[PDB]
Scaffold this motif. Structure first.
Motif, PDB file in Angstrom:
ATOM      1  N   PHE A   1       0.799  -1.206   0.000  1.00  0.00           N
ATOM      2  CA  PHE A   1       0.000   0.000   0.000  1.00  0.00           C
ATOM      3  C   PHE A   1       0.840   1.268   0.000  1.00  0.00           C
ATOM      4  N   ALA A   2       2.156   1.121   0.065  1.00  0.00           N
ATOM      5  CA  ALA A   2       3.029   2.290   0.072  1.00  0.00           C
ATOM      6  C   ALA A   2       2.851   3.143  -1.192  1.00  0.00           C
ATOM      7  N   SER A   3       2.638   2.487  -2.330  1.00  0.00           N
ATOM      8  CA  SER A   3       2.332   3.190  -3.574  1.00  0.00           C
ATOM      9  C   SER A   3       1.052   3.991  -3.440  1.00  0.00           C
ATOM     10  N   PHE A   4       0.004   3.309  -2.985  1.00  0.00           N
ATOM     11  CA  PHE A   4      -1.313   3.900  -2.789  1.00  0.00           C
ATOM     12  C   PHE A   4      -1.279   5.106  -1.849  1.00  0.00           C
ATOM     13  N   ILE A   5      -0.628   4.948  -0.706  1.00  0.00           N
ATOM     14  CA  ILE A   5      -0.522   6.030   0.250  1.00  0.00           C
ATOM     15  C   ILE A   5       0.049   7.277  -0.421  1.00  0.00           C
ATOM     16  N   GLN A   6       1.276   7.142  -0.921  1.00  0.00           N
ATOM     17  CA  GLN A   6       1.969   8.167  -1.708  1.00  0.00           C
ATOM     18  C   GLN A   6       1.051   8.851  -2.739  1.00  0.00           C
ATOM     19  N   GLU A   7       0.402   8.054  -3.584  1.00  0.00           N
ATOM     20  CA  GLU A   7      -0.473   8.588  -4.622  1.00  0.00           C
ATOM     21  C   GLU A   7      -1.594   9.475  -4.077  1.00  0.00           C
ATOM     22  N   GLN A   8      -2.294   8.995  -3.058  1.00  0.00           N
ATOM     23  CA  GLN A   8      -3.378   9.755  -2.436  1.00  0.00           C
ATOM     24  C   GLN A   8      -2.916  11.088  -1.841  1.00  0.00           C
ATOM     25  N   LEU A   9      -1.871  11.048  -1.032  1.00  0.00           N
ATOM     26  CA  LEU A   9      -1.366  12.273  -0.439  1.00  0.00           C
ATOM     27  C   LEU A   9      -1.072  13.316  -1.524  1.00  0.00           C
TER      28      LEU A   9
ATOM     29  N   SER B   1      14.774  -0.865  10.179  1.00  0.00           N
ATOM     30  CA  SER B   1      15.293  -1.027   8.834  1.00  0.00           C
ATOM     31  C   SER B   1      14.269  -1.532   7.807  1.00  0.00           C
ATOM     32  N   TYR B   2      13.475  -2.546   8.160  1.00  0.00           N
ATOM     33  CA  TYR B   2      12.457  -3.070   7.236  1.00  0.00           C
ATOM     34  C   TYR B   2      11.382  -2.043   6.853  1.00  0.00           C
ATOM     35  N   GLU B   3      10.965  -1.214   7.813  1.00  0.00           N
ATOM     36  CA  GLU B   3       9.991  -0.155   7.559  1.00  0.00           C
ATOM     37  C   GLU B   3      10.636   1.026   6.845  1.00  0.00           C
ATOM     38  N   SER B   4      11.950   1.156   7.018  1.00  0.00           N
ATOM     39  CA  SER B   4      12.712   2.273   6.459  1.00  0.00           C
ATOM     40  C   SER B   4      12.426   2.471   4.974  1.00  0.00           C
ATOM     41  N   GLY B   5      11.835   3.608   4.625  1.00  0.00           N
ATOM     42  CA  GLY B   5      11.468   3.843   3.249  1.00  0.00           C
ATOM     43  C   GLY B   5      10.006   4.192   3.029  1.00  0.00           C
ATOM     44  N   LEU B   6       9.132   3.746   3.928  1.00  0.00           N
ATOM     45  CA  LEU B   6       7.701   4.045   3.829  1.00  0.00           C
ATOM     46  C   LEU B   6       7.415   5.530   3.999  1.00  0.00           C
ATOM     47  N   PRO B   7       6.283   5.990   3.442  1.00  0.00           N
ATOM     48  CA  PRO B   7       5.789   7.350   3.648  1.00  0.00           C
ATOM     49  C   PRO B   7       5.832   7.716   5.130  1.00  0.00           C
ATOM     50  N   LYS B   8       6.303   8.926   5.419  1.00  0.00           N
ATOM     51  CA  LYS B   8       6.488   9.381   6.786  1.00  0.00           C
ATOM     52  C   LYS B   8       5.293  10.222   7.218  1.00  0.00           C
TER      53      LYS B   8
ATOM     54  N   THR C   1       2.836  21.049   4.712  1.00  0.00           N
ATOM     55  CA  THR C   1       3.590  21.502   3.528  1.00  0.00           C
ATOM     56  C   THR C   1       4.753  20.608   3.089  1.00  0.00           C
ATOM     57  N   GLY C   2       5.067  20.692   1.801  1.00  0.00           N
ATOM     58  CA  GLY C   2       6.271  20.096   1.269  1.00  0.00           C
ATOM     59  C   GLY C   2       6.052  18.721   0.688  1.00  0.00           C
ATOM     60  N   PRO C   3       7.143  17.957   0.564  1.00  0.00           N
ATOM     61  CA  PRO C   3       7.103  16.604   0.024  1.00  0.00           C
ATOM     62  C   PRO C   3       6.726  15.627   1.122  1.00  0.00           C
ATOM     63  N   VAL C   4       6.107  14.521   0.737  1.00  0.00           N
ATOM     64  CA  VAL C   4       5.960  13.418   1.669  1.00  0.00           C
ATOM     65  C   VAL C   4       7.338  12.930   2.163  1.00  0.00           C
ATOM     66  N   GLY C   5       7.500  12.852   3.477  1.00  0.00           N
ATOM     67  CA  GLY C   5       8.743  12.359   4.034  1.00  0.00           C
ATOM     68  C   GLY C   5       8.905  10.860   3.863  1.00  0.00           C
ATOM     69  N   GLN C   6      10.134  10.375   3.986  1.00  0.00           N
ATOM     70  CA  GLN C   6      10.366   8.939   3.964  1.00  0.00           C
ATOM     71  C   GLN C   6      10.757   8.500   5.369  1.00  0.00           C
ATOM     72  N   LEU C   7      10.143   7.420   5.842  1.00  0.00           N
ATOM     73  CA  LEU C   7      10.293   7.030   7.231  1.00  0.00           C
ATOM     74  C   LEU C   7      11.681   6.468   7.528  1.00  0.00           C
ATOM     75  N   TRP C   8      12.241   6.915   8.652  1.00  0.00           N
ATOM     76  CA  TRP C   8      13.511   6.417   9.169  1.00  0.00           C
ATOM     77  C   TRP C   8      14.584   6.282   8.111  1.00  0.00           C
TER      78      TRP C   8
END
Ligand SMILES: O=c1[nH]c(=O)n([C@H]2C[C@H](O)[C@@H](COP(=O)(O)O)O2)cc1/C=C/Br
Ligand SMILES: O=c1[nH]c(=O)n([C@H]2C[C@H](O)[C@@H](COP(=O)(O)O)O2)cc1/C=C/Br
Ligand SMILES: O=c1[nH]c(=O)n([C@H]2C[C@H](O)[C@@H](COP(=O)(O)O)O2)cc1/C=C/Br
Ligand SMILES: [Mg+2]
Ligand SMILES: [Mg+2]
Ligand SMILES: [Mg+2]
Ligand SMILES: [Mg+2]
Lengths: 203, 203
Positions: free
Chosen positions: B74-82, B113-120, B195-202
Protein backbone atom coordinates in the motif's frame (compact mmCIF):
# COMPACT_ATOMS: atom_id res chain seq x y z
CA UNK A 1 9.61 -44.45 17.35
CA UNK A 2 8.36 -41.73 15.02
CA UNK A 3 8.87 -41.69 11.28
CA UNK A 4 12.06 -40.15 9.96
CA UNK A 5 12.23 -36.73 8.31
CA UNK A 6 14.30 -37.26 5.19
CA UNK A 7 15.12 -34.31 2.92
CA UNK A 8 16.52 -34.29 -0.60
CA UNK A 9 18.60 -31.26 -1.70
CA UNK A 10 20.78 -30.34 -4.69
CA UNK A 11 20.89 -28.05 -7.71
CA UNK A 12 18.20 -28.11 -10.38
CA UNK A 13 18.43 -31.17 -12.65
CA UNK A 14 20.49 -33.04 -10.02
CA UNK A 15 17.76 -35.67 -10.34
CA UNK A 16 16.49 -35.60 -6.76
CA UNK A 17 12.98 -36.14 -8.14
CA UNK A 18 14.12 -39.44 -9.71
CA UNK A 19 15.74 -40.59 -6.47
CA UNK A 20 12.56 -39.66 -4.59
CA UNK A 21 10.74 -41.89 -7.01
CA UNK A 22 13.08 -44.78 -6.14
CA UNK A 23 12.51 -44.51 -2.40
CA UNK A 24 8.74 -44.43 -2.98
CA UNK A 25 8.91 -47.65 -4.96
CA UNK A 26 11.45 -49.31 -2.63
CA UNK A 27 9.30 -48.94 0.51
CA UNK A 28 5.73 -49.82 1.46
CA UNK A 29 3.45 -46.83 1.01
CA UNK A 30 1.41 -47.38 4.17
CA UNK A 31 4.47 -46.10 6.12
CA UNK A 32 5.94 -43.40 3.89
CA UNK A 33 4.81 -40.03 2.47
CA UNK A 34 6.18 -38.00 -0.44
CA UNK A 35 6.33 -34.22 -0.11
CA UNK A 36 7.46 -31.87 -2.96
CA UNK A 37 8.50 -28.24 -2.41
CA UNK A 38 7.43 -25.89 -3.51
CA UNK A 39 3.86 -27.02 -3.14
CA UNK A 40 2.66 -25.13 -6.21
CA UNK A 41 -1.01 -25.92 -5.60
CA UNK A 42 -1.54 -23.57 -2.62
CA UNK A 43 -2.13 -19.83 -2.57
CA UNK A 44 1.55 -19.13 -2.13
CA UNK A 45 2.20 -21.98 -4.55
CA UNK A 46 0.33 -20.55 -7.51
CA UNK A 47 2.12 -17.30 -6.96
CA UNK A 48 5.47 -19.08 -6.79
CA UNK A 49 4.48 -20.81 -10.02
CA UNK A 50 3.84 -17.46 -11.76
CA UNK A 51 7.30 -16.24 -10.71
CA UNK A 52 9.27 -19.33 -11.80
CA UNK A 53 7.46 -19.41 -15.17
CA UNK A 54 8.21 -15.72 -15.80
CA UNK A 55 4.58 -14.50 -15.89
CA UNK A 56 4.94 -12.23 -12.86
CA UNK A 57 7.77 -10.66 -10.89
CA UNK A 58 8.05 -9.73 -7.25
CA UNK A 59 10.50 -8.13 -4.83
CA UNK A 60 13.41 -10.31 -3.88
CA UNK A 61 11.81 -9.65 -0.50
CA UNK A 62 8.49 -11.05 -1.56
CA UNK A 63 9.74 -14.23 -3.13
CA UNK A 64 11.96 -15.12 -0.18
CA UNK A 65 8.93 -15.11 2.08
CA UNK A 66 6.51 -16.72 -0.33
CA UNK A 67 8.76 -19.81 -0.31
CA UNK A 68 9.09 -19.74 3.45
CA UNK A 69 5.37 -19.30 4.05
CA UNK A 70 4.86 -22.05 1.47
CA UNK A 71 6.72 -24.37 3.84
CA UNK A 72 4.99 -23.28 7.05
CA UNK A 73 1.54 -24.26 5.70
CA UNK A 74 2.84 -27.78 6.03
CA UNK A 75 4.86 -27.65 9.25
CA UNK A 76 1.78 -28.88 11.16
CA UNK A 77 1.27 -31.72 8.69
CA UNK A 78 4.91 -32.77 8.82
CA UNK A 79 4.98 -32.90 12.61
CA UNK A 80 1.67 -34.87 12.74
CA UNK A 81 2.82 -37.53 10.26
CA UNK A 82 6.15 -38.16 11.93
CA UNK A 83 4.46 -38.59 15.30
CA UNK A 84 1.94 -40.94 13.61
CA UNK A 85 4.92 -43.05 12.63
CA UNK A 86 4.98 -42.06 8.94
CA UNK A 87 8.39 -41.33 7.43
CA UNK A 88 8.68 -38.21 5.29
CA UNK A 89 10.52 -38.00 1.99
CA UNK A 90 10.83 -34.36 1.04
CA UNK A 91 11.99 -32.86 -2.25
CA UNK A 92 13.64 -29.51 -1.27
CA UNK A 93 13.25 -27.79 2.10
CA UNK A 94 14.60 -25.02 4.36
CA UNK A 95 18.00 -25.29 2.67
CA UNK A 96 16.61 -24.78 -0.82
CA UNK A 97 15.30 -21.56 0.73
CA UNK A 98 18.46 -20.23 2.35
CA UNK A 99 20.85 -21.25 -0.43
CA UNK A 100 18.75 -19.76 -3.19
CA UNK A 101 17.82 -16.65 -1.20
CA UNK A 102 21.47 -16.18 -0.16
CA UNK A 103 22.74 -16.73 -3.71
CA UNK A 104 20.58 -13.73 -4.64
CA UNK A 105 22.42 -11.54 -2.16
CA UNK A 106 20.33 -12.10 0.95
CA UNK A 107 21.76 -12.58 4.44
CA UNK A 108 22.39 -16.23 5.23
CA UNK A 109 21.78 -15.78 8.97
CA UNK A 110 18.59 -13.87 8.22
CA UNK A 111 17.30 -16.44 5.71
CA UNK A 112 17.88 -19.00 8.43
CA UNK A 113 15.93 -17.11 11.08
CA UNK A 114 12.77 -17.37 8.93
CA UNK A 115 13.07 -21.17 8.69
CA UNK A 116 14.05 -21.36 12.36
CA UNK A 117 11.41 -23.46 14.06
CA UNK A 118 10.48 -25.97 11.35
CA UNK A 119 10.70 -29.74 11.93
CA UNK A 120 14.38 -30.78 11.87
CA UNK A 121 15.53 -33.43 9.32
CA UNK A 122 17.26 -36.62 10.47
CA UNK A 123 19.01 -37.02 7.21
CA UNK A 124 19.64 -34.66 4.35
CA UNK A 125 20.65 -36.26 1.11
CA UNK A 126 22.53 -33.89 -1.13
CA UNK A 127 22.89 -34.86 -4.77
CA UNK A 128 26.04 -33.59 -6.50
CA UNK A 129 25.65 -32.43 -10.10
CA UNK A 130 28.56 -33.20 -12.41
CA UNK A 131 29.18 -32.13 -16.01
CA UNK A 132 26.16 -33.46 -17.89
CA UNK A 133 23.93 -32.33 -15.00
CA UNK A 134 24.76 -28.68 -14.34
CA UNK A 135 24.74 -28.09 -18.08
CA UNK A 136 21.27 -29.58 -18.10
CA UNK A 137 20.05 -26.15 -16.96
CA UNK A 138 18.51 -24.43 -20.00
CA UNK A 139 16.48 -21.70 -18.29
CA UNK A 140 12.99 -23.05 -18.89
CA UNK A 141 12.43 -21.80 -15.34
CA UNK A 142 13.68 -18.72 -13.56
CA UNK A 143 16.61 -19.96 -11.48
CA UNK A 144 17.65 -22.49 -14.16
CA UNK A 145 20.87 -20.74 -15.15
CA UNK A 146 24.32 -22.34 -14.98
CA UNK A 147 26.10 -19.25 -13.72
CA UNK A 148 23.53 -18.73 -10.94
CA UNK A 149 23.43 -22.40 -9.83
CA UNK A 150 27.22 -22.24 -9.36
CA UNK A 151 26.38 -19.47 -6.89
CA UNK A 152 23.73 -21.45 -4.99
CA UNK A 153 26.27 -24.28 -4.64
CA UNK A 154 28.61 -21.95 -2.78
CA UNK A 155 25.85 -21.40 -0.26
CA UNK A 156 24.98 -25.11 -0.01
CA UNK A 157 28.58 -26.10 0.69
CA UNK A 158 28.73 -23.41 3.42
CA UNK A 159 25.76 -24.92 5.28
CA UNK A 160 27.04 -28.45 5.02
CA UNK A 161 30.33 -27.40 6.64
CA UNK A 162 28.25 -26.06 9.54
CA UNK A 163 26.97 -29.56 10.16
CA UNK A 164 24.68 -29.68 13.15
CA UNK A 165 22.53 -31.46 10.60
CA UNK A 166 23.09 -35.03 9.45
CA UNK A 167 24.10 -34.75 5.77
CA UNK A 168 24.81 -37.51 3.24
CA UNK A 169 26.55 -36.25 0.09
CA UNK A 170 26.09 -38.43 -2.96
CA UNK A 171 28.71 -38.18 -5.71
CA UNK A 172 27.78 -37.30 -9.27
CA UNK A 173 29.97 -40.12 -10.55
CA UNK A 174 27.95 -43.12 -9.38
CA UNK A 175 26.00 -45.27 -11.81
CA UNK A 176 22.21 -44.83 -11.92
CA UNK A 177 21.30 -48.30 -10.55
CA UNK A 178 24.12 -48.08 -7.99
CA UNK A 179 23.15 -44.60 -6.80
CA UNK A 180 19.60 -45.89 -6.53
CA UNK A 181 20.80 -48.81 -4.39
CA UNK A 182 23.13 -46.75 -2.21
CA UNK A 183 20.49 -44.15 -1.34
CA UNK A 184 17.86 -46.86 -0.77
CA UNK A 185 20.24 -48.28 1.82
CA UNK A 186 20.93 -45.13 3.84
CA UNK A 187 17.25 -44.31 3.70
CA UNK A 188 16.01 -47.56 5.25
CA UNK A 189 18.73 -47.19 7.82
CA UNK A 190 17.73 -43.65 8.77
CA UNK A 191 14.28 -45.15 9.35
CA UNK A 192 15.13 -48.05 11.68
CA UNK A 193 17.74 -46.06 13.61
CA UNK A 194 15.47 -43.06 14.46
CA UNK A 195 14.65 -42.06 18.07
CA UNK A 196 13.24 -39.33 20.28
CA UNK A 197 11.33 -36.11 19.65
CA UNK A 198 11.20 -34.33 16.31
CA UNK A 199 13.93 -31.69 16.37
CA UNK A 200 13.33 -28.02 15.64
CA UNK A 201 15.46 -26.58 12.89
CA UNK A 202 18.13 -23.96 13.69
CA UNK A 203 17.01 -23.23 17.19
CA UNK B 1 -0.48 21.25 -0.47
CA UNK B 2 -0.77 17.49 -0.28
CA UNK B 3 -2.99 15.67 2.15
CA UNK B 4 -1.63 14.86 5.60
CA UNK B 5 -0.53 11.40 6.66
CA UNK B 6 -2.11 10.84 10.04
CA UNK B 7 -1.42 7.64 11.97
CA UNK B 8 -3.19 6.25 15.04
CA UNK B 9 -1.21 4.03 17.43
CA UNK B 10 -1.73 2.48 20.86
CA UNK B 11 -2.23 -0.88 22.58
CA UNK B 12 -5.09 -3.20 21.65
CA UNK B 13 -8.45 -1.98 22.99
CA UNK B 14 -7.12 1.58 23.30
CA UNK B 15 -10.07 2.53 21.11
CA UNK B 16 -8.12 3.89 18.17
CA UNK B 17 -10.76 2.37 15.87
CA UNK B 18 -13.45 4.45 17.62
CA UNK B 19 -11.41 7.63 17.27
CA UNK B 20 -10.77 6.85 13.60
CA UNK B 21 -14.54 6.61 13.27
CA UNK B 22 -14.91 10.13 14.73
CA UNK B 23 -12.47 11.68 12.29
CA UNK B 24 -14.28 10.02 9.39
CA UNK B 25 -17.59 11.49 10.49
CA UNK B 26 -16.15 14.92 11.42
CA UNK B 27 -14.61 15.57 7.96
CA UNK B 28 -15.95 15.50 4.40
CA UNK B 29 -15.19 12.16 2.74
CA UNK B 30 -14.28 13.58 -0.65
CA UNK B 31 -11.01 14.69 1.00
CA UNK B 32 -10.14 11.97 3.46
CA UNK B 33 -9.38 8.21 3.27
CA UNK B 34 -9.47 5.56 6.04
CA UNK B 35 -6.79 2.86 6.07
CA UNK B 36 -6.74 -0.06 8.57
CA UNK B 37 -3.66 -2.20 9.26
CA UNK B 38 -3.29 -4.97 8.95
CA UNK B 39 -5.11 -5.14 5.70
CA UNK B 40 -6.43 -8.68 6.30
CA UNK B 41 -7.96 -9.02 2.86
CA UNK B 42 -4.68 -9.37 0.90
CA UNK B 43 -2.47 -12.44 0.45
CA UNK B 44 -0.31 -11.41 3.38
CA UNK B 45 -3.49 -10.36 5.11
CA UNK B 46 -5.24 -13.71 5.08
CA UNK B 47 -2.08 -15.24 6.43
CA UNK B 48 -1.84 -12.62 9.16
CA UNK B 49 -5.49 -13.40 9.93
CA UNK B 50 -4.70 -17.13 10.36
CA UNK B 51 -1.93 -16.29 12.83
CA UNK B 52 -3.87 -13.83 14.98
CA UNK B 53 -6.85 -16.20 15.17
CA UNK B 54 -4.59 -19.11 16.25
CA UNK B 55 -5.30 -21.34 13.22
CA UNK B 56 -1.69 -21.35 12.02
CA UNK B 57 1.72 -20.54 13.46
CA UNK B 58 4.81 -19.18 11.85
CA UNK B 59 8.37 -18.21 12.74
CA UNK B 60 8.26 -15.09 14.93
CA UNK B 61 10.63 -13.74 12.30
CA UNK B 62 8.31 -14.64 9.44
CA UNK B 63 5.27 -12.96 11.04
CA UNK B 64 7.46 -9.87 11.39
CA UNK B 65 7.87 -9.75 7.60
CA UNK B 66 4.25 -10.67 6.82
CA UNK B 67 3.21 -7.49 8.62
CA UNK B 68 5.85 -5.41 6.92
CA UNK B 69 5.06 -6.74 3.44
CA UNK B 70 1.40 -6.15 4.25
CA UNK B 71 2.24 -2.42 4.59
CA UNK B 72 4.41 -2.17 1.45
CA UNK B 73 1.53 -3.34 -0.85
CA UNK B 74 0.00 0.00 0.00
CA UNK B 75 3.03 2.29 0.07
CA UNK B 76 2.33 3.19 -3.57
CA UNK B 77 -1.31 3.90 -2.79
CA UNK B 78 -0.52 6.03 0.25
CA UNK B 79 1.97 8.17 -1.71
CA UNK B 80 -0.47 8.59 -4.62
CA UNK B 81 -3.38 9.75 -2.44
CA UNK B 82 -1.37 12.27 -0.44
CA UNK B 83 -0.07 13.80 -3.68
CA UNK B 84 -3.67 13.85 -4.98
CA UNK B 85 -4.53 16.00 -2.00
CA UNK B 86 -6.33 13.32 0.03
CA UNK B 87 -5.47 13.08 3.73
CA UNK B 88 -4.83 9.61 5.16
CA UNK B 89 -6.22 8.34 8.42
CA UNK B 90 -4.40 5.14 9.29
CA UNK B 91 -5.14 2.63 12.04
CA UNK B 92 -1.71 1.14 13.04
CA UNK B 93 1.44 1.52 10.95
CA UNK B 94 5.24 1.06 11.00
CA UNK B 95 5.31 1.51 14.77
CA UNK B 96 2.76 -1.20 15.44
CA UNK B 97 5.32 -3.30 13.58
CA UNK B 98 8.47 -2.36 15.47
CA UNK B 99 6.90 -2.23 18.95
CA UNK B 100 5.20 -5.59 18.63
CA UNK B 101 8.17 -7.20 16.87
CA UNK B 102 10.56 -5.79 19.45
CA UNK B 103 8.35 -6.83 22.36
CA UNK B 104 8.76 -10.39 21.09
CA UNK B 105 12.53 -10.10 21.43
CA UNK B 106 13.44 -8.76 18.00
CA UNK B 107 16.02 -6.03 17.37
CA UNK B 108 14.44 -2.57 17.43
CA UNK B 109 16.97 -1.16 14.94
CA UNK B 110 16.48 -4.13 12.63
CA UNK B 111 12.67 -3.93 12.79
CA UNK B 112 13.08 -0.29 11.82
CA UNK B 113 15.29 -1.03 8.83
CA UNK B 114 12.46 -3.07 7.24
CA UNK B 115 9.99 -0.16 7.56
CA UNK B 116 12.71 2.27 6.46
CA UNK B 117 11.47 3.84 3.25
CA UNK B 118 7.70 4.04 3.83
CA UNK B 119 5.79 7.35 3.65
CA UNK B 120 6.49 9.38 6.79
CA UNK B 121 3.53 10.50 8.99
CA UNK B 122 2.98 14.18 9.82
CA UNK B 123 1.19 13.33 13.00
CA UNK B 124 1.10 10.20 15.08
CA UNK B 125 -1.69 10.05 17.59
CA UNK B 126 -0.93 7.70 20.42
CA UNK B 127 -3.85 6.62 22.62
CA UNK B 128 -2.98 5.85 26.22
CA UNK B 129 -4.78 2.87 27.81
CA UNK B 130 -5.70 3.26 31.48
CA UNK B 131 -7.15 0.71 33.91
CA UNK B 132 -10.43 -0.30 32.27
CA UNK B 133 -8.67 -0.42 28.89
CA UNK B 134 -5.58 -2.59 29.32
CA UNK B 135 -7.70 -5.07 31.28
CA UNK B 136 -10.02 -5.12 28.30
CA UNK B 137 -7.56 -7.57 26.72
CA UNK B 138 -9.08 -11.05 27.06
CA UNK B 139 -7.02 -12.97 24.51
CA UNK B 140 -9.60 -13.46 21.78
CA UNK B 141 -6.67 -12.77 19.48
CA UNK B 142 -3.03 -13.71 19.70
CA UNK B 143 -1.32 -10.59 21.10
CA UNK B 144 -4.29 -9.80 23.33
CA UNK B 145 -2.58 -10.50 26.64
CA UNK B 146 -2.15 -7.93 29.42
CA UNK B 147 1.37 -9.05 30.41
CA UNK B 148 2.53 -8.89 26.77
CA UNK B 149 0.91 -5.49 26.05
CA UNK B 150 2.80 -4.05 29.01
CA UNK B 151 5.91 -5.13 27.10
CA UNK B 152 4.83 -3.50 23.80
CA UNK B 153 4.26 -0.25 25.65
CA UNK B 154 7.91 -0.21 26.77
CA UNK B 155 8.86 -0.30 23.10
CA UNK B 156 6.32 2.39 22.13
CA UNK B 157 7.59 4.76 24.83
CA UNK B 158 11.17 4.24 23.60
CA UNK B 159 10.28 5.35 20.04
CA UNK B 160 8.36 8.38 21.22
CA UNK B 161 11.40 9.60 23.19
CA UNK B 162 13.42 9.39 19.95
CA UNK B 163 11.05 11.95 18.45
CA UNK B 164 12.06 12.81 14.92
CA UNK B 165 8.40 12.08 14.39
CA UNK B 166 5.57 14.42 15.33
CA UNK B 167 3.72 12.60 18.15
CA UNK B 168 0.57 13.62 20.00
CA UNK B 169 -0.05 11.58 23.17
CA UNK B 170 -3.66 11.48 24.33
CA UNK B 171 -4.30 10.69 28.00
CA UNK B 172 -6.50 7.81 29.07
CA UNK B 173 -8.33 10.05 31.54
CA UNK B 174 -10.21 12.28 29.13
CA UNK B 175 -13.99 11.98 28.69
CA UNK B 176 -15.25 10.29 25.53
CA UNK B 177 -16.87 13.35 23.95
CA UNK B 178 -13.93 15.55 25.02
CA UNK B 179 -11.31 13.15 23.67
CA UNK B 180 -13.32 13.05 20.47
CA UNK B 181 -13.30 16.88 20.33
CA UNK B 182 -9.61 17.24 21.19
CA UNK B 183 -8.42 14.78 18.56
CA UNK B 184 -10.80 16.26 15.99
CA UNK B 185 -9.05 19.54 16.62
CA UNK B 186 -5.45 18.44 16.23
CA UNK B 187 -6.39 16.48 13.15
CA UNK B 188 -7.94 19.35 11.20
CA UNK B 189 -4.92 21.41 12.20
CA UNK B 190 -2.45 18.84 10.96
CA UNK B 191 -4.39 19.11 7.72
CA UNK B 192 -4.32 22.88 7.13
CA UNK B 193 -0.75 23.27 8.39
CA UNK B 194 0.86 20.64 6.07
CA UNK B 195 3.59 21.50 3.53
CA UNK B 196 6.27 20.10 1.27
CA UNK B 197 7.10 16.60 0.02
CA UNK B 198 5.96 13.42 1.67
CA UNK B 199 8.74 12.36 4.03
CA UNK B 200 10.37 8.94 3.96
CA UNK B 201 10.29 7.03 7.23
CA UNK B 202 13.51 6.42 9.17
CA UNK B 203 15.87 7.35 6.41
O1 LIG C 1 12.89 -21.50 -0.97
C1 LIG C 1 13.09 -21.73 -2.16
N1 LIG C 1 12.80 -22.99 -2.61
C2 LIG C 1 13.04 -23.25 -3.96
O2 LIG C 1 12.79 -24.38 -4.37
N2 LIG C 1 13.50 -22.32 -4.84
C3 LIG C 1 13.68 -22.78 -6.26
C4 LIG C 1 14.64 -23.91 -6.51
C5 LIG C 1 14.48 -24.06 -8.03
O3 LIG C 1 15.27 -23.14 -8.77
C6 LIG C 1 13.00 -23.66 -8.20
C7 LIG C 1 12.12 -24.73 -8.85
O4 LIG C 1 12.26 -25.93 -8.10
P1 LIG C 1 11.84 -27.35 -8.71
O5 LIG C 1 10.74 -27.27 -9.70
O6 LIG C 1 13.19 -28.02 -9.36
O7 LIG C 1 11.54 -28.25 -7.37
O8 LIG C 1 12.51 -23.27 -6.89
C8 LIG C 1 13.78 -21.04 -4.38
C9 LIG C 1 13.60 -20.77 -3.02
C10 LIG C 1 13.80 -19.48 -2.52
C11 LIG C 1 14.11 -18.38 -3.57
BR1 LIG C 1 14.35 -16.70 -2.85
O1 LIG D 1 7.48 -5.27 0.07
C1 LIG D 1 8.46 -4.52 -0.02
N1 LIG D 1 8.48 -3.56 -1.05
C2 LIG D 1 9.57 -2.65 -1.16
O2 LIG D 1 9.61 -1.82 -2.07
N2 LIG D 1 10.63 -2.82 -0.38
C3 LIG D 1 11.82 -1.96 -0.32
C4 LIG D 1 11.84 -1.20 1.00
C5 LIG D 1 13.16 -0.43 0.86
O3 LIG D 1 12.99 0.91 0.34
C6 LIG D 1 13.85 -1.41 -0.16
C7 LIG D 1 15.30 -1.77 0.07
O4 LIG D 1 15.56 -3.05 -0.50
P1 LIG D 1 17.02 -3.59 -0.25
O5 LIG D 1 17.92 -2.55 0.33
O6 LIG D 1 16.87 -4.87 0.73
O7 LIG D 1 17.58 -4.16 -1.65
O8 LIG D 1 13.03 -2.59 -0.10
C8 LIG D 1 10.59 -3.72 0.67
C9 LIG D 1 9.53 -4.59 0.86
C10 LIG D 1 9.71 -5.50 1.90
C11 LIG D 1 8.62 -6.53 2.22
BR1 LIG D 1 9.04 -7.64 3.63
O1 LIG E 1 3.58 -5.09 12.31
C1 LIG E 1 2.65 -5.39 13.06
N1 LIG E 1 1.45 -4.73 12.93
C2 LIG E 1 0.40 -5.07 13.76
O2 LIG E 1 -0.63 -4.43 13.55
N2 LIG E 1 0.50 -6.05 14.72
C3 LIG E 1 -0.69 -6.40 15.62
C4 LIG E 1 -1.18 -5.38 16.66
C5 LIG E 1 -2.38 -6.14 17.28
O3 LIG E 1 -1.95 -6.86 18.39
C6 LIG E 1 -2.80 -7.16 16.17
C7 LIG E 1 -4.31 -7.22 15.84
O4 LIG E 1 -4.67 -6.19 14.89
P1 LIG E 1 -5.90 -5.08 15.06
O5 LIG E 1 -7.17 -5.61 14.18
O6 LIG E 1 -6.27 -4.84 16.47
O7 LIG E 1 -5.36 -3.70 14.34
O8 LIG E 1 -1.95 -6.88 14.99
C8 LIG E 1 1.73 -6.72 14.86
C9 LIG E 1 2.79 -6.37 14.03
C10 LIG E 1 4.02 -7.03 14.10
C11 LIG E 1 4.08 -8.17 15.10
BR1 LIG E 1 5.72 -9.03 15.17
MG1 LIG F 1 13.08 -27.10 -12.21
MG1 LIG G 1 10.89 -31.41 -8.10
MG1 LIG H 1 -7.31 -6.66 17.93
MG1 LIG I 1 -7.87 -1.67 13.87
Amino acid sequence: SRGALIVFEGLDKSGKTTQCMNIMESIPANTIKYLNFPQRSTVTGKMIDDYLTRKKTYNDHIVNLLFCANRWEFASFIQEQLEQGITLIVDRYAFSGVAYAAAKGASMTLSKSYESGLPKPDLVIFLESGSKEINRNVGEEIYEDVTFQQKVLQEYKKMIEEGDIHWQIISSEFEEDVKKELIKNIVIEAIHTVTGPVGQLWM
